[PDB]
Amino acid sequence: GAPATVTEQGEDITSKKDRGVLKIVKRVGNGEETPMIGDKVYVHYKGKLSNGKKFDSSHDRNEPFVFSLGKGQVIKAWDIGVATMKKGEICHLLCKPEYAYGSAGSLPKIPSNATLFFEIELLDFKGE
């Protein structure tokens, strides 16, 4: 399925090249610009534990998910991965625990050492 495809074909967008954040573009966006640290980003997404459990549809097409990029308002994998997106782009993002909740997890929802998968659509972004 989609997580396996990102394992096999995904691009490693980590600084360390440790495969901790793997990406596939599923729909190409518009233009060339991608958001800078401090930009406000507006997203629709859905995600899960990579093994299918704990599905999150809270922002799948209803109210946008909003945060300021590169400020640690989200897990590291998102500050890294949403930064690479164009407006209108949809990507698949596979996130190892060191870029997500680590060995701590976020119990009971996220277990210790969990890999996460997201389908993310960047709707817009704007300067601070």
Residues in the chain: 128
- Decide: is 71 part of the binding site for ligand 37L (CB under 6 A): no
Supply 120's token pair: 């993310």
Contact flag: residue 75 with ligand 37L (CB under 6 A):
yes
78 binds ligand 37L (CB under 6 A): yes
Contact call for residue 109 and ligand 37L (CB under 6 A): yes
Q: Please provide residue 35's backbone torsions phi and psi, each rounded to the nearest 5 degrees.
A: -75, 150
Find the shortest distance in angstroms from Cβ 69 to ligand 37L. 11
Specify the residue for token string 């990406």. 23
57 binds ligand 37L (CB under 6 A): no
Q: Is the dihedral of CA 34, 38, 42, 45 positive or negative?
A: positive
Q: CB of 9: closest distance to ligand 37L in angstroms? A: 22
Binding of residue 42 to ligand 37L (CB under 6 A): no
Q: Which residues are catalytic?
A: 45, 55-56, 75, 101, 118
9 touches 94 (CB < 8 A) = no
Of 13, 74, 83, 91, the residue at the interface with ligand 37L (CB under 6 A) is: 74
Q: Is 106 in the site for ligand 37L (CB under 6 A)?
A: yes
- What is the Rg, in whole angstroms, of the alpha carbon atoms belonging to the chain? 14
CB-based burial of residue 84 (10 Å sphere; 0-12 exposed, 13-18 middle, 19+ buried)?
Answer: middle
- The residue ranges that bind ligand 37L (CB under 6 A) are 47-48, 54, 56, 58, 65, 67, 72-75, 78, 106, 109-110, 116
